[model samples]
Target: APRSVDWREKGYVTPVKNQGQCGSCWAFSATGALEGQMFRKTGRLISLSEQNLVDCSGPQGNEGCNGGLMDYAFQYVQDNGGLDSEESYPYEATEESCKYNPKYSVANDAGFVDIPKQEKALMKAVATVGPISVAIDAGHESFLFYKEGIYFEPDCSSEDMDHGVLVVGYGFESTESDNNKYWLVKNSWGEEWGMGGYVKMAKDRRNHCGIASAASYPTV
Candidate 1:
């Protein structure tokens, strides 16, 4: 099936942010998702600062890097007037200052869409919309695998909440391959990590990343 999402209509893609060694996959995913939504609504791919959310999103149960829920982060942004850019605020990978930029404030009411019982809703959201934030077992020594028709069992369990990534697109490896279906994913581990900063995930095994939810933002 050709799963698709309205990426252009919802706006996606912003300058990538490095989470450093912290396990704050939830923060990055939350920021990335909102950044895409803001761009979609404003037609501008402004680099929103992750530090603002990391430091000020407030009281999220998970500490720096351990893990978090994107839904909570979205709610934090909604109540806080959104976040700034790395240039405007910067990220130390650790919680720091939250310097608000009055010159540029996008919508704050960013909300997530539930995937319900169908895992395919997650795929369809990515296929048709802005970059979908997802969790995966990034335990792979390297996530940069771009070869077509490639399928490998990740080394981690589906319940291990350790990594976050952006689902960019999906395709089949061709009839010659045994496991052909895959999702093209973007990782934050740098260009050297995955397929030049990307990875092809077995379309069926993505639940290993603990993708508890998928969400985005809206104009306030």
Candidate 2:
């Protein structure tokens, strides 16, 4: 296996985004994974619209900005034929009515798959299959103001994943606590948070935060 992999360095990652007050992290995560796969196939980087899923994936078990699941968002895109670009349907960070336009469709999601709930599996997926959508228990204050350094919250749960993010890469490094394996995670909390809208979450820590519990990725 590769020692480390960062999709951002390969131009598969888009700029950091902000979900604002909306609980639309799932949409962002789904789109991020799809965007990476699309770039891998088409050699083009087109930002998919999270707003499209946020406003339209209700029937797929998504509750708009209130909360949602990445796999469900992928299903919505697959069933809807395609997803539009972020420029066409910009994020409002609110539960607005659906305004998806087939004319502006950018990426077509064929389907998606759920990775096994294992850190090694997640690592292999990100290393070979591109970015993977994941859910985690990001209910800690440290996560809220996370800066540099690998993030590890003891209170982070493995059974209650309340937030969605993307695993773009991973690496091993030295740390204060000395457990240095980490996953390079992309968050929807904007560039101002963490390491420019990303976080190196502690990895191989018994599925800390349930990051791999609900992991998934879209198929182009």
Candidate 3:
């Protein structure tokens, strides 16, 4: 295993984006994973459409603009044939009418896998799988205004994950008398939040904030 890993540095990650007031973080997380897989296979970092999932995956158990799950979104794309590019079906952050066109499709998943709910399992998955879709609790006050550092909330619960995001990499950072292990998480909250819309959460902390509880990734 590598001591440090960052998919962004290797160009597997797309630019940090915004999901606005929408609860469409799940779509972004799913697409983020798919985008990584697509890039690795085709050598193209095309941005897949979160809006397509938002607008069309309701039947797949995703409540667009309200909330959803990455696994469900992945299945939707697979069953619906494929997903359009962001340019073809841009994100409006609202529940819109489904206007899917397979002609403009850029990518699609064959299937997905749900990771075991453990920190070490998640670590191995991120290290081997490129990027992963996971959910976390964004309900804490500090989480909403997080800027940087190893984000750790002792009171956060693993039983309830209210937001979805991507795990790009993991690393060990030591400073003075303190050493930290963190997961490099990519958020859909845009580039203005956290570390450019990314957050390094406390890793190996017994699934802090449910980071590993609902983790999965596409098999493109």
Candidate 4:
């Protein structure tokens, strides 16, 4: 077992990003995990391109800007090729004709790993493998306007996940906690949304909103 860890506190998290009106949170989540894996392995935090996934991951089951999954995005990277830099592909936040160009790649993932479907194992995975890509239920109104606090909806279904996010860290919050015993998640709703573009979700509540339902980490 590993001690509690906060990858964000250790600077593994990149700046908050925005997915705009696109339902492509999966791209952001996968890219965030990829970014963390690259940083941990290479000691250089490089932001990869979500546009590449948004445009080219269709063959892997991603519906472009409509919707997608982290696992599928990772598979696309593994099957097709390396990922490009954000500076090269950039984010347009809308479904468009494929414009992916791997020639501008700045990073690559050999494969991915799935975290066990348990809270204890999930925490250990985050502590040892950098940030993880996770899916959650964003249908709750509390999630839309979540400013701060450990988000625990007793009414939220554990299998009702509909959104994707990046789990950069896990820890307990004191007076200034982000839900203290919560998972620090990076959202793509822009900094103006949620807590500085981040959300602290309650952890270990039997897989709240299925946050622990679908999670994985990229391997550089």
Residues 36-59, candidate 4, lDDT per residue (tens digit)? Answer: 988888888888888889988998
Worst 10 residues of 4 by lDDT: 171-180
User: What C-alpha lDDT do the candidate models reach, one value each?
Assistant: 0.60, 0.93, 0.91, 0.84
Residue 47 Cα positional deviation in candidate 1, in Å, after optimal superposition: 1.3
Best by lDDT: 2
Clash numbers, per candidate: 25, 0, 0, 4
On TM-score, who's better, 1 or 2?
Answer: 2
**Candidate 4 Cα misplacement greater than 4 A, ranges:** 1-3, 174-180
Better of 3 and 4 by TM-score: 3
Off by over 4 Å in 1: 1-11, 60-62, 101-104, 140-151, 175-177, 205-220
* Tens digit per residue, CA lDDT, model 2, 1-220: 7989998899899988999999999999999999999999999999989999999999999999889999899999889998999999999999988898999999987899889989989988999989999999999999998998899998999999899999999998988788989999999998999988889999999999998899999988
Best-matching candidate per TM-score: 2
Residue-by-residue lDDT tens digits, candidate 1, 157-179: 56664566666666665546465
By lDDT rank, best first, the candidates go: 2, 3, 4, 1
Better of 3 and 4 by lDDT: 3
Clashing pairs in 3: none
Error of 1 at 212 (Å): 7.2
Candidate 1, position 212, lDDT: 29
lDDT of 3 at 43: 89
Q: Report residue 104 deviation for candidate 4 (angstroms).
A: 0.7
